Symmetry: C2
Subunit: 133 residues, 2 copies
């Protein structure tokens, strides 16, 4: 439907050019939404060890990931007032952590919308019109 922001490797919080482009589309969407809609950028990791890395927990890596994406959104014009970030650490995985490929699905940031019922449909249509030909 709409992809989360997937990170290159398991230990990285780096935002590459492709992800920058994707964050820009999402920033563009957020600004057409009703102002009472708020955005929570959620960070997650796989279960890969954090040896050979500066981070002392997956909650840190996940926070850094989410904080970064939110900062790129702010750079594209999204209002700080509509935004927050959350770290979920290694909890709540999307796929099994059995393979490199599935592990990478877990290393992500997700966008949650906070919306009343009457605004929900506007978001739905705005999201459809952006992410379809």
């Amino acid at each position: 439907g709409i992809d989360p922001f997937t990170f290159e490797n398991a230990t990285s919080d780096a935002i590459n050019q492709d992800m920058m482009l994707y964050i820009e589309r999402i920033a563009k969407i957020i600004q057409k939404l009703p102002k009472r809609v708020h955005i929570n950028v959620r960070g997650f990791t796989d279960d890969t060890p954090l040896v050979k890395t500066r981070f002392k927990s997956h909650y840190e890596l996940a926070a850094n990931r989410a904080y970064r994406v939110m900062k790129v959104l702010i750079q594209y014009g999204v209002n700080p007032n509509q935004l927050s970030f959350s770290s979920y650490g290694s909890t709540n995985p999307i796929a099994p952590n059995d393979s490199l490929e599935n592990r990478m699905k877990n290393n992500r940031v997700e966008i949650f919308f906070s919306t009343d019922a009457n605004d929900l449909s506007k978001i739905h249509s705005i999201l459809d019109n952006e992410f379809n030909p």
Copy 2:
């Protein structure tokens, strides 16, 4: 006791260098607190009209203030996992909005700690042993 971060003028989120040095002293403090203490950075304003400004509400001004302070704390070593920011707009003044000086008191960011009872005592000492030794 510990002062809030005060903003120079009513309509800006600009941080001067005596208060930037002060944010760095607070980031230093935060890094010495128990890992389970989280920190909420809160933005407030006075009630002066948003004439000739980019901000469309006091909530937006306060949110940009809080977010900026939070960004600087992260700059000086605070784990993003422990941080959040919140806007209160022109609600919750600490002073009446009846004089220029009283209004300046209202244009500020405050630090709120999220702590259990046993960490509460630890924060107490750290703040005492730093701000009144």
